[PDB]
Amino acid sequence: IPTVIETTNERAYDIYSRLLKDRIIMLGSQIDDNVANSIVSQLLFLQAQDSEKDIYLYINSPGGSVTAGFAIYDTIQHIKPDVQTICIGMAASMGSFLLAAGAKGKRFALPNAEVMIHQPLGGAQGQATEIEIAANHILKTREKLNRILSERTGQSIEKIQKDTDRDNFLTAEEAKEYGLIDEVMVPET
Amino acid sequence: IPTVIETTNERAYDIYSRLLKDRIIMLGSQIDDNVANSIVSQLLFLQAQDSEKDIYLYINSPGGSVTAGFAIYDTIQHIKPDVQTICIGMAASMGSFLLAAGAKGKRFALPNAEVMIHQPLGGAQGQATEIEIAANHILKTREKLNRILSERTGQSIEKIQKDTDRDNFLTAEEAKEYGLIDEVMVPE
Amino acid sequence: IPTVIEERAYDIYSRLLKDRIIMLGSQIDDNVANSIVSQLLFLQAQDSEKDIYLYINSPGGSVTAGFAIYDTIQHIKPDVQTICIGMAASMGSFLLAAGAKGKRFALPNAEVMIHQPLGGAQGQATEIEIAANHILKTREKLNRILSERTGQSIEKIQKDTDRDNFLTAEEAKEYGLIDEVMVPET
Amino acid sequence: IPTVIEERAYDIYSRLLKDRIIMLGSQIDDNVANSIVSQLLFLQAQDSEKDIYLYINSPGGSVTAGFAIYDTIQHIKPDVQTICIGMAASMGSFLLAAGAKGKRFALPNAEVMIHQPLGGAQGQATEIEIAANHILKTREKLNRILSERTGQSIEKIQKDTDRDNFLTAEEAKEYGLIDEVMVPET
Amino acid sequence: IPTVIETTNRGERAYDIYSRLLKDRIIMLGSQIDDNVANSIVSQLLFLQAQDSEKDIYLYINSPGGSVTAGFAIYDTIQHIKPDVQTICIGMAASMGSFLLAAGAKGKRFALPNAEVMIHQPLGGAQGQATEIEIAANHILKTREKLNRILSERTGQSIEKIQKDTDRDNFLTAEEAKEYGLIDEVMVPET
Amino acid sequence: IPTVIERAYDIYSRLLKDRIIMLGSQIDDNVANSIVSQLLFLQAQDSEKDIYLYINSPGGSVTAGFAIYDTIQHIKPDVQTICIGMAASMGSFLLAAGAKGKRFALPNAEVMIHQPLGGAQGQATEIEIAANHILKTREKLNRILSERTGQSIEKIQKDTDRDNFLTAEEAKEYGLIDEVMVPE
Amino acid sequence: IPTVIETTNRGERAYDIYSRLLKDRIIMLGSQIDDNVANSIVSQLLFLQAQDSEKDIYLYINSPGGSVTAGFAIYDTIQHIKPDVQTICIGMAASMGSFLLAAGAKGKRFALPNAEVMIHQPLGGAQGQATEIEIAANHILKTREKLNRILSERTGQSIEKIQKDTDRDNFLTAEEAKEYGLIDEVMVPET
Amino acid sequence: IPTVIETTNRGERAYDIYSRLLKDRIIMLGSQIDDNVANSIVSQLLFLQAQDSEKDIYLYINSPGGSVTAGFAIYDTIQHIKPDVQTICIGMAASMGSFLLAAGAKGKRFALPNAEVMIHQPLGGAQGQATEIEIAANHILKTREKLNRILSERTGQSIEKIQKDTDRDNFLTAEEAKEYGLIDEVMVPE
Amino acid sequence: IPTVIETTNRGERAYDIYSRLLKDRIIMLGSQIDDNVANSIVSQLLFLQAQDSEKDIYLYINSPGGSVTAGFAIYDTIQHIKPDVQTICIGMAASMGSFLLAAGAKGKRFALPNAEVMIHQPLGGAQGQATEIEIAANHILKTREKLNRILSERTGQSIEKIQKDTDRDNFLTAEEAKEYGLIDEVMVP
Numbered sequence A: 001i002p003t004v005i006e007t008t009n010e011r012a013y014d015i016y017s018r019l020l021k022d023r024i025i026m027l028g029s030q031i032d033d034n035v036a037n038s039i040v041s042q043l044l045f046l047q048a049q050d051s052e053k054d055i056y057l058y059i060n061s062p063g064g065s066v067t068a069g070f071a072i073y074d075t076i077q078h079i080k081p082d083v084q085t086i087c088i089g090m091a092a093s094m095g096s097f098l099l100a101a102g103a104k105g106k107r108f109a110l111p112n113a114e115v116m117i118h119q120p121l122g123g124a125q126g127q128a129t130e131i132e133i134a135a136n137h138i139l140k141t142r143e144k145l146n147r148i149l150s151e152r153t154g155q156s157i158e159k160i161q162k163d164t165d166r167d168n169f170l171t172a173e174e175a176k177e178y179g180l181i182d183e184v185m186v187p188e189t
Numbered sequence B: 001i002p003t004v005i006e007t008t009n010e011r012a013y014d015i016y017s018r019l020l021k022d023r024i025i026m027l028g029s030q031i032d033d034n035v036a037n038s039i040v041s042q043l044l045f046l047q048a049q050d051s052e053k054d055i056y057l058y059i060n061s062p063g064g065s066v067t068a069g070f071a072i073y074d075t076i077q078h079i080k081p082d083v084q085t086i087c088i089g090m091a092a093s094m095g096s097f098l099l100a101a102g103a104k105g106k107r108f109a110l111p112n113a114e115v116m117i118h119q120p121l122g123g124a125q126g127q128a129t130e131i132e133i134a135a136n137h138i139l140k141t142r143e144k145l146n147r148i149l150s151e152r153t154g155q156s157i158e159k160i161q162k163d164t165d166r167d168n169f170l171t172a173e174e175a176k177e178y179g180l181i182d183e184v185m186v187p188e
Numbered sequence C, D: 001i002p003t004v005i006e007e008r009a010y011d012i013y014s015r016l017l018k019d020r021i022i023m024l025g026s027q028i029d030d031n032v033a034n035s036i037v038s039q040l041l042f043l044q045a046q047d048s049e050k051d052i053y054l055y056i057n058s059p060g061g062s063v064t065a066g067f068a069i070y071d072t073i074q075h076i077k078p079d080v081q082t083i084c085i086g087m088a089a090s091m092g093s094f095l096l097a098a099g100a101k102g103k104r105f106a107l108p109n110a111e112v113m114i115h116q117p118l119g120g121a122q123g124q125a126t127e128i129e130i131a132a133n134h135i136l137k138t139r140e141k142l143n144r145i146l147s148e149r150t151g152q153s154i155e156k157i158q159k160d161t162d163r164d165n166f167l168t169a170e171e172a173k174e175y176g177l178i179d180e181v182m183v184p185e186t
Numbered sequence E, G: 001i002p003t004v005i006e007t008t009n010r011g012e013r014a015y016d017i018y019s020r021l022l023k024d025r026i027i028m029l030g031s032q033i034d035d036n037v038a039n040s041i042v043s044q045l046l047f048l049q050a051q052d053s054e055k056d057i058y059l060y061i062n063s064p065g066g067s068v069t070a071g072f073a074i075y076d077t078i079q080h081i082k083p084d085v086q087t088i089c090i091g092m093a094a095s096m097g098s099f100l101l102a103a104g105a106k107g108k109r110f111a112l113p114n115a116e117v118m119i120h121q122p123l124g125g126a127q128g129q130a131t132e133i134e135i136a137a138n139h140i141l142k143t144r145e146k147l148n149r150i151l152s153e154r155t156g157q158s159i160e161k162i163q164k165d166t167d168r169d170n171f172l173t174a175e176e177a178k179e180y181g182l183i184d185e186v187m188v189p190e191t
Numbered sequence F: 001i002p003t004v005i006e007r008a009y010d011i012y013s014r015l016l017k018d019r020i021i022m023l024g025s026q027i028d029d030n031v032a033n034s035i036v037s038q039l040l041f042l043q044a045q046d047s048e049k050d051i052y053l054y055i056n057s058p059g060g061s062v063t064a065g066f067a068i069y070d071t072i073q074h075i076k077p078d079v080q081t082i083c084i085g086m087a088a089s090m091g092s093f094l095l096a097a098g099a100k101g102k103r104f105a106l107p108n109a110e111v112m113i114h115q116p117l118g119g120a121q122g123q124a125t126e127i128e129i130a131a132n133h134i135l136k137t138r139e140k141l142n143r144i145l146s147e148r149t150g151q152s153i154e155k156i157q158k159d160t161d162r163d164n165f166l167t168a169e170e171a172k173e174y175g176l177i178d179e180v181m182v183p184e
Numbered sequence H: 001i002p003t004v005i006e007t008t009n010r011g012e013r014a015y016d017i018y019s020r021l022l023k024d025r026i027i028m029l030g031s032q033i034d035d036n037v038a039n040s041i042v043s044q045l046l047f048l049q050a051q052d053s054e055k056d057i058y059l060y061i062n063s064p065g066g067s068v069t070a071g072f073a074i075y076d077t078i079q080h081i082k083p084d085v086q087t088i089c090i091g092m093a094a095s096m097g098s099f100l101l102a103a104g105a106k107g108k109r110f111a112l113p114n115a116e117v118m119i120h121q122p123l124g125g126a127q128g129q130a131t132e133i134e135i136a137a138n139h140i141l142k143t144r145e146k147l148n149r150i151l152s153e154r155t156g157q158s159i160e161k162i163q164k165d166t167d168r169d170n171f172l173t174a175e176e177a178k179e180y181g182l183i184d185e186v187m188v189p190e
Numbered sequence I: 001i002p003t004v005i006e007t008t009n010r011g012e013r014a015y016d017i018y019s020r021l022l023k024d025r026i027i028m029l030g031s032q033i034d035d036n037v038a039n040s041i042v043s044q045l046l047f048l049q050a051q052d053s054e055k056d057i058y059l060y061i062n063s064p065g066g067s068v069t070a071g072f073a074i075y076d077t078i079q080h081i082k083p084d085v086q087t088i089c090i091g092m093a094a095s096m097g098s099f100l101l102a103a104g105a106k107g108k109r110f111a112l113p114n115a116e117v118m119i120h121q122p123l124g125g126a127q128g129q130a131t132e133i134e135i136a137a138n139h140i141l142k143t144r145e146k147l148n149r150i151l152s153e154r155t156g157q158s159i160e161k162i163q164k165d166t167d168r169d170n171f172l173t174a175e176e177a178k179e180y181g182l183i184d185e186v187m188v189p
């Protein structure tokens, strides 16, 4: 991880910390509780710095913990600044959920980025009533995810259910048509 | 596993095979598909030998596969002879279910034998709809087990549900009172 | 595994085989298939008229090994009865359905399950394609034969095998996988 | 593995061997080959006129062990029928094709697969060269014999074995690996 | 990792050797491409643009390749930014590494004389139900078409030729890579 | 392993009744002891009649191989050697050790010859001892192969330096076998 | 392990090949010498004596050696019994295996032409306190003196030569073993 | 890894011992050659050129070799840059390590008296289908020709002799390496 | 590993204890000799020469030995540089460690009273074809002759005596090492 030195009228930054100085947050790995806590803490801090200016959330993630994902989601919605979401490389599972949770009109993906949507994965072991509890829980968390995706894509709950049943790979352009993003970010002129 | 000799007008038997000659079947281990297939085959054979005479099912088992258990259960009910069930040492899970499935009035347990009843155990991993399928399945299998236990003990489905929620250890005497067995087999 | 004696000594499974009963009681692999195939061919040579009884308590297994058993059942002259006791799943329930017309049974609390075939593929994109085309062609093949023997449509079987589908013995009868639920005697 | 009594007692596979049926039902290694070879030589000594039946349900295996079986089949006087049930892949399908002319069969839903031989090489560049030359020479050898026995060209076999190639029984007949699909009575 | 110290009029700065290369707009892609490596490269590229949107960037490539998806994070970011990104293959560029070598700015894709370039199909895996394997197979095949289409655009070779030539591992010399269109020049040694 | 009845025999034991010995696996001390015991027994049964040694082996222990070799040479009967499938390393050595004019291979059988493999670990003088030993055992093997193929020690050394795969026909030309056993 | 059936005037008996050799007073020492192998060989020797105390016994040796203690179980039993025990080295006799080769009856110790004979010191181990290591070291050294003394008696070589010659691994040809006194003759083929 | 502190006119600067050697244009190739080691050495070489394109660079070699590809990253970068790169074998230079020893600037390839130089063929592996093994075999053989050709150019020995001499492991003394042409001089004590 | 601070009147510096010893021209060879340890020691020796080509260097040795090749990297660099390199065995010097102890500047090779010196043959391994084993055996034997020749030169003992004496592990007291010629004096308190 390289270091960059910025000159003034000189401060040293690791490249990711430097991006954070310009209000860019990197969600570039599997989403676990650690990654969520860091992103949450960055979002809260960037608000305290400036509650008006845009934040940029870079997403290259295969997804991960639903619950950790919702830590990030709730914090994005809570804070005053618009949070732009930009999918580069890949956004899958909770990663593509969070891609869709970006501020209205500021959800992007670069041309060859990969977006995937599916159902949540989990597990249950033990007594029949314990398995029932876990099954009811993961199903309730599927309804919750599907409801919010419906709100933010404009697709129906019924269509999202059908389309998330098995792994569903989308192109950037297909993600735009679906409502997961607003624009495909074309290269500059 | 020792060998014994029978005389008459002489054959060598391993001790378990000799018990089988006197219509005694040993269910003495964890119930898996192998054990079930052997017990099923023994039951069918003993019927062909004599469709009138009683069969004796010895049970010292912690239970095991529900499906394999129901292979034994259905075969017991299907055949013409009465199948006595005798719990010695321990009958737990599907083992105690099968103890209760013995012929009416011929379900026994020795004084210090342990009987335990509980819910079926399982597992599910993967997508939400896959976990749903597995959960619906194990719950349907619970209703099925509870319904048959109700029929054979005389207890209500509601009471069996409550009483199987956690592990429930019973004495032989308590098992009699519950309806899982008919008598505690007293000594000379 | 106990021994029974009638002047001749038999292990219990071999004694069942003397009365034309074959035990399919485990995961279906190439060994189990070869044994069952060999038993079926032998029972035909003993008597080509008399019924054979195929006991099924199996979670299924190899599709290819399953089709060894299937083809041999169809090839031989005797009717092969199929009787599901405990559980018949995957290729086990396929073979349950392959029994002679009108002689496919299940006992009351037996469990029947149907689903799609499972497999794997690893390597280059064209290698994965080959494996994917293969498992899909083997799904069509299984679905076609199940359609023929249950009387259900290929389209319905596809829908119904998409995820694991547990059936009661009675539900299996209604579906056409078996002909009768074998009730207890009098 | 069940026992049948005919009084002489036989394990089911040994009984099949009494009727000149040899089971090739597993991965082909040196053990399996040695057993099959020994069975073939014995059956010849019993009767050099009567047909032998080689059952094949194998994913293949050792090329060299395979050629032990192949050479022994060709050497002995009796015709060796080959019958693919379930699956014949790799060296298994090679041996299926090596059966006596006009007596190579497969049951309707049996699976036949052909591909190139698999191997490995590790060490110095000249050691890898030696191993590479060797496996390539053994590919030419296999392809040449398959060409002779199917009637297909060496060039077509090379193209068709490049990647895994799954065939139906009917497709195997058209290809020349077998002479006929063994239909049931109906 | 060696530290070097630079001297100026406002002070001395200490740099790890790689960070010092980054100060001169040189980015090191020198390992298996995973999501971490991609995120770092992307972040470097975005930063170097903000420093100066006119000046060239130099992407050193010694990589066996790796994640296709992580590779496309780097690719899309190269194309998006204003500066030309030079690509220089030293030692080896294979799989997604050679793809990215070809994605350098037109006329500024280089390889040193004894560098190794390899092209092949993407690798993957699938396990489970037949319809799950179908999905994965369709996906990796669509990703092959996507890679082949872009390689066609940037080498000038046809999609049909790239398909044939990537079927199995295909090792190229630097000179062969030039002829193929993966690079523009073999970088000869100086005077 | 199937049983045949004539008196019940496992298939390999039945081959032994007709003086056929199976060398069908990696050569270790167990396999050698069995083969040696079979050879001594078959001599006691009949010291005139031929013995048939089937070979489908990748080779193995040099020392165990020489147990079989010395016993073949010692006994009165001719021991035919027949390579089916594969004969490599000590397996191809033993193929060559068959009675003069009765060394065969079937058409697609594989014969391979190479140097002996080994290992040494510890002090410099311990490695020296092990190196001298494996080199002396190479000379020994090369000398006997020279005697039985008719090739020179120098040519065998060159030809065994790296793995050398031969066809049955090539093995005949080389002198490892006398004939390729054709089908009638 | 194959079965042979011997057909005679009193019967039809079936033998595993090794048991058949034992019927002709041939004992197989064909593996690593541990306590099991020793107990079997001892039991065979005692039985063959009870069968016939006049007739020769034949001890086949193809062994890399092993337990010294187990080896001395075999040695002492050979010396105790009345019959001569011939020893025949085929393939290899090493460590305690070559010791036992030398322990055969005087004039009846053989090796086939390409058999390998090796002699060396006993191997062992010690771990723990200094006085425990001392005990183990004294023990293995006394056991070396014991082996060397008996080898001296049976080869005719001096204790001091055996010590020098067993210091490192010492490989001998059959012919060299004859010259050394470990065997009496190299068994040459018929003619 | 110890730290040394220097005193000058622009400060008092702390260096890890290896970084201090780099300040005097000395690069340490002291481990198995993998892609990391190559990238570091390449980056050091490019930096030392930018510092001063006239002054000599010193490449210390104590390596058993390693990746051929990574080795050629170092080789090509040495040849590309303007400064002479001296090569000095201390302890051991084997496989790609001895190749790089030979790639030093003409007349400035050294080895200390008891240093060990070894040359052999490249090692590799191949697993899978016959055509896959063919591809890998052709590749490692083409890479052998490539290495042999360059060694021929820099030692002055023929391609045929190098092939024969690299067939199995070949250990050389420093003096034998001089005679062979892998180095120019054995560096005697002062 | 503790830190010491040199508090002077001109320049306060912090040093890890080993780096501080290096400031006084003391090099620690205190572990198994591998290529890393050799490269570090070599680099220290070269640096100390550049600092002052007249002043003595002190090489502390507490090592069980290790790589012969790496050992000869250290040996050759000692002999090459202009300063005398003192060698001081404390605790233990074995294998290549005792070789390097003997390679110290004439008259400046020391050992403390209860230090342990051990000499033996080099250890190695060989696996594969007979000709490969031959090559490895010839190599380790040539390397033994090389070590024995240099030990002979620096102890004053004959090559024949060193061969005999290194055949098996040979433990020496400090005093015995002096008598042998591996060191010049036992450093008394």
Ligand SMILES: CC(C)C[C@H]1C(=O)N(Cc2cccc3ccccc23)C[C@@H]2N(C(=O)NCc3ccccc3)CCC(=O)N21
Pocket (backbone or CB within 6 Å): A040, A044, A045, A046, A048, A075, A078
């Ligand atoms: C609506 C709150 C934004 C306001 C309230 C509050 O509820 N929290 C709890 C709190 C803790 C962690 C994460 C959260 C995420 C979401 C919501 C709340 C979260 C802390 C917050 N503070 C703050 O933001 N300070 C700004 C700041 C300063 C320095 C670093 C980072 C942020 C401190 C003072 C205060 O009253 N609050």
Ligand SMILES: CC(C)C[C@H]1C(=O)N(Cc2cccc3ccccc23)C[C@@H]2N(C(=O)NCc3ccccc3)CCC(=O)N21
Pocket (backbone or CB within 6 Å): B040, B044, B045, B048, B075, B078, C015, C016, C019, C021, C053, C054, C055, C083, C085
């Ligand atoms: C009892 C018959 C009324 C049921 C019917 C049948 O469906 N099967 C299939 C079958 C196979 C395995 C296990 C089963 C368990 C339960 C029910 C069936 C089971 C076998 C049975 N046979 C039989 O008992 N023969 C006598 C016998 C002799 C020796 C051993 C065992 C049984 C063959 C003749 C016949 O019509 N049947």
Ligand SMILES: CC(C)C[C@H]1C(=O)N(Cc2cccc3ccccc23)C[C@@H]2N(C(=O)NCc3ccccc3)CCC(=O)N21
Pocket (backbone or CB within 6 Å): C037, C041, C042, C045, C072, C075, D015, D016, D019, D021, D053, D054, D055, D083, D085
């Ligand atoms: C189709 C045969 C019914 C007729 C024909 C044949 O095609 N095979 C091939 C063959 C081999 C193995 C398994 C098969 C499975 C299915 C179809 C074929 C299979 C063997 C068979 N034999 C036989 O049944 N013998 C009777 C027998 C006696 C005792 C045990 C087993 C079988 C030997 C004599 C003979 O001509 N045949």
Ligand SMILES: CC(C)C[C@H]1C(=O)N(Cc2cccc3ccccc23)C[C@@H]2N(C(=O)NCc3ccccc3)CCC(=O)N21
Pocket (backbone or CB within 6 Å): D037, D041, D042, D045, D072, D075, F014, F015, F018, F020, F052, F053, F054, F082, F084
């Ligand atoms: C047709 C003969 C000319 C073949 C010839 C021969 O070359 N071998 C070598 C040999 C050994 C093993 C496997 C082989 C496979 C193929 C060819 C050869 C094989 C043995 C064979 N014998 C035989 O068949 N005996 C009959 C028999 C009886 C009982 C069991 C098995 C075989 C013994 C007598 C004899 O001359 N021969």
Ligand SMILES: CC(C)C[C@H]1C(=O)N(Cc2cccc3ccccc23)C[C@@H]2N(C(=O)NCc3ccccc3)CCC(=O)N21
Pocket (backbone or CB within 6 Å): A018, A019, A022, A024, A056, A057, A058, A086, A088, E042, E046, E047, E050, E077, E080
């Ligand atoms: C061309 C605009 C669309 C760029 C736009 C934007 O979309 N992002 C998102 C973003 C995040 C990560 C990686 C990306 C890669 C490609 C595109 C976008 C990427 C950040 C960017 N910013 C910036 O460059 N700031 C300057 C800077 C300073 C120091 C380091 C890096 C960047 C912040 C200000 C701003 O409006 N944007």
Ligand SMILES: CC(C)C[C@H]1C(=O)N(Cc2cccc3ccccc23)C[C@@H]2N(C(=O)NCc3ccccc3)CCC(=O)N21
Pocket (backbone or CB within 6 Å): F036, F040, F041, F044, F071, F074, G020, G021, G024, G026, G058, G059, G060, G088, G090
């Ligand atoms: C032919 C004699 C020259 C051999 C002589 C001899 O020195 N041995 C030692 C001995 C043991 C093991 C393996 C050997 C292999 C090769 C040579 C020798 C081997 C065995 C042999 N015997 C024998 O053949 N008995 C016949 C027999 C019958 C049945 C089965 C096996 C052997 C016992 C009686 C006897 O004096 N001898």
Ligand SMILES: CC(C)C[C@H]1C(=O)N(Cc2cccc3ccccc23)C[C@@H]2N(C(=O)NCc3ccccc3)CCC(=O)N21
Pocket (backbone or CB within 6 Å): G042, G043, G046, G047, G048, G050, G077, G080
């Ligand atoms: C020469 C007598 C001193 C032997 C004496 C004795 O000391 N033992 C102990 C004993 C046991 C095991 C192994 C030994 C090895 C060496 C010495 C002794 C060993 C057993 C022996 N017996 C016997 O040989 N019976 C005959 C026999 C029959 C069948 C098989 C084996 C032996 C029982 C009768 C008897 O008095 N003795």
Ligand SMILES: CC(C)C[C@H]1C(=O)N(Cc2cccc3ccccc23)C[C@@H]2N(C(=O)NCc3ccccc3)CCC(=O)N21
Pocket (backbone or CB within 6 Å): E020, E021, E024, E026, E058, E059, E060, E088, E090, H042, H046, H047, H050, H077, H080
């Ligand atoms: C010698 C010029 C002809 C090379 C040319 C070029 O092609 N590269 C690419 C490049 C990158 C990495 C490693 C390489 C290795 C070999 C060849 C090329 C390599 C970098 C170089 N730069 C430079 O040296 N900058 C100075 C510098 C400062 C600090 C440390 C290192 C270098 C940047 C400016 C520039 O145009 N170039």
Ligand SMILES: CC(C)C[C@H]1C(=O)N(Cc2cccc3ccccc23)C[C@@H]2N(C(=O)NCc3ccccc3)CCC(=O)N21
Pocket (backbone or CB within 6 Å): H020, H021, H024, H026, H058, H059, H060, H086, H088, H090, I042, I046, I047, I048, I050, I077, I080
């Ligand atoms: C009498 C000349 C032959 C010495 C000459 C040389 O050939 N090397 C190669 C070299 C590299 C690595 C390790 C070695 C170990 C032993 C011998 C040589 C070694 C280094 C030296 N330099 C120097 O000392 N610079 C001063 C310095 C400053 C800081 C730390 C170390 C040294 C660079 C300038 C120079 O011309 N030389």
